[PDB]
């Protein structure tokens, strides 16, 4: 038995639990897409654009562990670049497959077939341009391993001619080894003895779980770490959802000066900060920084020491190192909103506190860069809730695509999980057509649109009335029907009373259909803290 | 007297006639953005996205001579690249200005601030990172001239801190030299002379005008060449609109073996070809290639001999060298469709033939990659018709953004110049949000949407009923209102009779409001030409 190189890929993909592929068909990927339908459990999303396809793979990747997007030579691959750059910046393993001329139009007129390939080489961990079938399987295996292991995008260029040549089916019987290289014995020992040492001498140690806490596997090792030690644990905004917000040792989200004052202090008064997975913004004492391929203790750098090993080892001796610890109280959780008349115009501060009431365990919460990403940091999540916020890259159309990707993976995990989006009126415009793909597949997300008439976040820092910070007003509610939706629901909310009425409805809380909920907000309204700093800034 | 570097940029643009600026605001471009408002007659489009705005910037240039797109570091720039590559491949003068962090987040997290610049350099004629106000003005002036003169994209990184820095206002009173340099005389002579000689011996000469005849401003000279020689004139697809088609010595669209038979015959049988050509993507040995920077006479290349002056100079002598040419019969125009009952379903073939009748002088015709770029070649254009067809880059979606741009340019040339767009339903999906911007500015293009339920060009090549060839079915007549159009018109045509009643209607022929026309076409229907090329694709 043989299999085509093309089916081979989808089969391996399925081995790593990639069931949905993103991208758009083109002149050089057609023969390869045919293969998707010869493998069971696999489906082609049929995205509305390549940039949007890149964004979805990213989101799906964030939920499932990896993703795949197929594009065509030039036109398709160059449109995805901003998505792949953001996956690269934030550590999302996205495998980007591109169909290329037949080892032989959508060219810069110069005869150069490697330009695009070399452009991507800048935002990838590794690149493969496949030219021989005898080497293909290994090559493909290699790109999948890398994407998955490093949680970085890989470019896999695949000529149209080779997708059709046969490869031994036998190859698939041997799984791709995803196991890491051990560390330098002497430096991993150095790091381990030193941490245990710091721990034994710290009176007020704190744990901070960042961005990569969960992408890099360590979410489990991080929760074990909390229980064993009993130190107060905090998430930074990129790590929100990494720690179950209902854990007694859960102390809050640490943003710097934007934090709730009691949170800011609890972290800042700490004599040891244990930091897991920084893409760090962050008096603050001795900081042990844990990164997937390096540690840092204080000012010292141990290049090459992977956190996985250090963390599996620490767990056998931490309870002991720490048995001298006297639990410190954690900052009390922000109290419920005061009762106000139902007429009360919606304000974000009210809203973000208020939202926590709507959320349930297993929710997928996506927040777009704008005042949306700032406000979500104020929402107390139930346990087992995943947060998505593109704080480092910060590409405004991101989330419409992320939501599709995330919904597709949720659907594969448990059709009962909910996908909630919080996106600004201005950002919805960059990537609106992706709502089309959700409808096509019967995905049922909650799309909340912050209608505040333009870009309030840039207005808060420069040109409150600069024409460039305004946009064409859209009739948001007609989006669903314009894109051929069938089973849907739209809603408008402008007051406290309306939020409640709809968010407390039992049918509402059920993901029976795709829904759009327009939120009416004042142009200059944002989370409190952001207005104080923004003003005097 | 001093002006800020930011305002100098806009002043110099005003001076080169770039009156509309494409792009999106962001982190690194706001103070620049503010200068646009201080310069009288200048305007900021406010695009729905960066891909879109590139597409738009390309559109504008095609009509006006050059254009300018303003983006932001990382996120803005990476998103425009498919657009910019597109301009590179087809020789379109786009100055991409990117606003970057001061000489010192939307980063790859590695502290490389030269990465995006490095990616742009492969699809740029020249690049510039401004770091000194001593030379800044000189850099800017240079970049604009290159964009202009080469008709190729240019990348200008402009650090946020420098934008507000002062410059002698006096530098503006001296105009950038936007003029081509005069040829080396001896070489120029050599060419002229042999051209003249060879013209004198040809019994059947032919003139062919390709992409660059339009792109590189030789439009007017080619025309007068045809009048003065009375040699048959043929265009290629990229060059359609390059020759005024109601000219008695104009014989058709040459597209090789796929050309109307007598078109093959008339061209193939020439004993001399004056290719007022372009982009060398390719009877006798007797070929004269005219190129923006060089000439080729048979096997003899003359580096640095610019067709512009060869042509001008040839017009002072050519008719004489030809006084003895007995004019060969030019191939016949295809006859008008035979009258059919009102009720006949529309067919593409009857359609492109008939369009020739609604079409008027000075119109802007945009036809998107799919059946539309194919069918347009079968349409007879009035004289002075500007056509836009991305034959070489072929990025579906391009047209929506370019329509925005062509329209801003068309309004600057003359408010009564009509802009007509043929886009497939598949393609619209990719750049749909750009209709918003059109509505924002009260622009009045004709948006024709070929509804044929999917990607019929693609289906006709591979997998007729493959799921990847199908689209989510949208309600197109709702787009205008959904994007907030107040004054517009929508229409749907499915028969010959409907086509006609609409297209002959006097108030419909006047660009009074923005209109959308859905064309109802059968799935597998395509122009005779795609029906022939297809075999082999
Ligand atoms: C692709 C891209 N272009 C430009 C920017 C710059 N930018 C940052 S936030 C923003 C406005 C987003 O506004 P909206 O979604 O309405 O959020 P709000 O603050 O109003 O809730 C813009 C244009 C960006 N981040 N990404
Ligand atoms: C950005 C990009 N993605 C993919 C392609 C490949 N592609 C070429 S034609 C086509 C379908 C065009 O569909 P439509 O506009 O519906 O045309 P028609 O039905 O008139 O043929 C696609 C997906 C491309 N050229 N550019
Ligand atoms: Mg907004
Ligand atoms: Mg179609």
Coordinates of N, CA and C in Angstrom, one line a residue, chain A residues 184-197 297-298 300 302 305:
Chain A
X184 N 21.5 20.7 29.4 CA 22.9 20.6 29.9 C 22.7 20.2 31.3
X185 N 23.3 19.1 31.8 CA 23.1 18.6 33.1 C 23.6 19.6 34.1
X186 N 24.8 20.1 34.1 CA 25.3 21.2 35.0 C 24.6 22.4 35.0
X187 N 24.1 23.0 33.9 CA 23.3 24.3 34.0 C 21.9 23.9 34.5
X188 N 21.3 22.8 34.2 CA 19.9 22.6 34.8 C 20.1 22.4 36.3
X189 N 21.1 21.8 36.7 CA 21.4 21.6 38.2 C 21.6 23.0 38.9
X190 N 22.4 23.8 38.3 CA 22.7 25.2 38.8 C 21.4 25.9 39.1
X191 N 20.5 25.9 38.0 CA 19.2 26.6 38.1 C 18.3 26.1 39.2
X192 N 18.2 24.8 39.3 CA 17.3 24.1 40.2 C 17.8 24.3 41.6
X193 N 19.1 24.1 41.9 CA 19.5 24.4 43.3 C 19.3 25.8 43.7
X194 N 19.5 26.7 42.8 CA 19.3 28.2 43.1 C 17.9 28.5 43.3
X195 N 17.0 28.0 42.6 CA 15.5 28.3 42.8 C 15.1 27.9 44.2
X196 N 15.3 26.6 44.4 CA 15.0 26.0 45.7 C 15.6 26.9 46.8
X197 N 16.8 27.4 46.6 CA 17.5 28.3 47.5 C 16.7 29.6 47.8
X297 N 17.7 34.2 36.2 CA 17.4 34.3 37.7 C 18.0 35.6 38.1
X298 N 17.3 36.5 38.6 CA 17.9 37.9 38.9 C 18.3 38.4 37.5
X300 N 21.1 37.0 36.0 CA 21.7 35.9 35.3 C 21.0 35.1 34.2
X302 N 20.8 31.8 31.7 CA 21.2 30.4 31.5 C 20.5 30.2 30.1
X305 N 18.6 26.3 28.7 CA 17.9 25.5 29.7 C 16.4 25.6 29.6

